Paper text:
Here, it is reported that multiple zinc ions can easily be charged onto the surface of proteins with no intrinsic zinc-binding site by using zinc-containing solutions. In conclusion, we demonstrated that protein crystals grown in the presence of zinc ions or soaked in a zinc-containing solution are easily charged with multiple zinc ions on the protein surface and that they are suitable for zinc SAD/MAD phasing. Considering the high phasing effectiveness and multiple zinc-binding sites, we believe that zinc derivatization of the protein surface is a largely unnoticed but promising method for phase determination of protein crystals.
Recently, we obtained crystals of [name] in a precipitant solution containing zinc acetate. Based on our confidence in zinc derivatization and phase determination, we collected a 2.3 Å resolution SAD data set from a crystal that was cooled in a cryostream at 100 K after briefly being immersed in a cryoprotectant solution consisting of 20% glycerol, 5%(v/v) 2-propanol, 100 mM sodium acetate pH 5.0, 350 mM zinc acetate. The [name] crystals, which contained six molecules per asymmetric unit, belonged to the tetragonal space group P43212, with unit-cell parameters a = b = 107.44, c = 355.03 Å. According to the plot of 〈d″/sig〉 versus resolution, zinc anomalous signal was present, although it decreased drastically at high resolution.
Numbering used by the authors: 11 to 269
Write the structure that this text describes.
């Protein structure tokens, strides 16, 4: 129940009614070698959180089911966490190397060049948005998912963030992405991408996704809850039940269309 981002969605979707469909389409048309990027350090521990990795993983799993290849660029602690899922890690990634670069909950620099958390605490850690500024310049397909306004891709709608989101002027990221997905919780944004791509392809790419398994797993591995900054199996302060609810609802929707 976060009011600012809810208002940014109404504004955004209102003028870009088809962002999810356009996003899903760019995705489906550039599967050859997809670089997926996640990991949001949380001040002051600067430890990544549970929002982002789950979604990146679902996209990765989906990219492979479709026949493409995916690698993940993220932080150390997330690699450990995502380790049980046998995910290919990116090694000295170069934009030129991919056909598409996605971002699920990743700090995007602000207008002042620095990085900030929803609480405007500066993030001090090596950035991961650079490759996006480069991807953009080269014209490589780029997609970004966020739920607050300080994530890579949110630069596409800074006016909206600055207007409805607390600390906006300072927090808002200037990094833009070709397509942008905004959702209450980024993971859910990635799941939407997968559900939309499922309807488009006629296969439910989300069938089998175990929300609970993944949250608990990565929470044990060390990834924290962004709001409680604790080690609870939750993402952005919402507990597993609601999250499973949304994933099960997305699955239902995918089927309804496919079948
Ligand atoms: Zn407005
Ligand atoms: Zn280059
Ligand atoms: Zn505040
Ligand atoms: Zn966020
Ligand atoms: Zn989040
Ligand atoms: Zn279509
Ligand atoms: Zn968060
Ligand atoms: Zn259920």
């Amino acid at each position: 129940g976060n009011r600012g981002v809810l208002k940014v969605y109404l504004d955004y979707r209102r003028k870009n009614f088809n962002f999810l469909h356009n996003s899903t389409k760019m995705f489906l048309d550039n599967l050859e070698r997809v670089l997926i990027v996640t990991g949001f350090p949380i001040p002051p521990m600067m430890v990544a959180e549970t929002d982002g990795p789950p979604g990146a993983l679902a996209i990765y799993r989906a990219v492979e089911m479709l026949g493409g290849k995916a690698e993940i660029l993220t932080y150390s602690e997330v690699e450990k966490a995502l380790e049980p899922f046998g995910v290919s890690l990116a090694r000295t990634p170069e934009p030129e190397d991919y056909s598409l670069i996605i971002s699920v909950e990743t700090p995007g620099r602000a207008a002042d060049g620095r990085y900030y958390s929803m609480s405007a605490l500066e993030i001090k850690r090596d950035p991961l948005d650079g490759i996006f500024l480069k991807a953009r310049a080269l014209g490589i397909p780029t997609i970004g998912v966020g739920d607050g306004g300080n994530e890579i891709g949110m630069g596409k709608i800074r006016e909206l963030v600055v207007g409805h989101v607390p600390h906006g002027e300072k927090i808002a990221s200037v990094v833009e992405t070709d397509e942008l997905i905004v959702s209450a919780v980024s993971n859910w944004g990635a799941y939407g991408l997968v559900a939309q791509a499922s309807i488009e392809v006629g296969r439910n790419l989300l069938e089998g996704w175990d929300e609970r398994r993944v949250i608990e797993a990565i929470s044990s591995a060390g990834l924290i809850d962004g709001v409680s900054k604790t080690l609870a199996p939750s993402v952005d302060g919402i507990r597993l039940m609601v999250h499973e609810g949304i994933v099960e609802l997305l699955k239902a929707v995918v089927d309804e269309a496919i079948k």
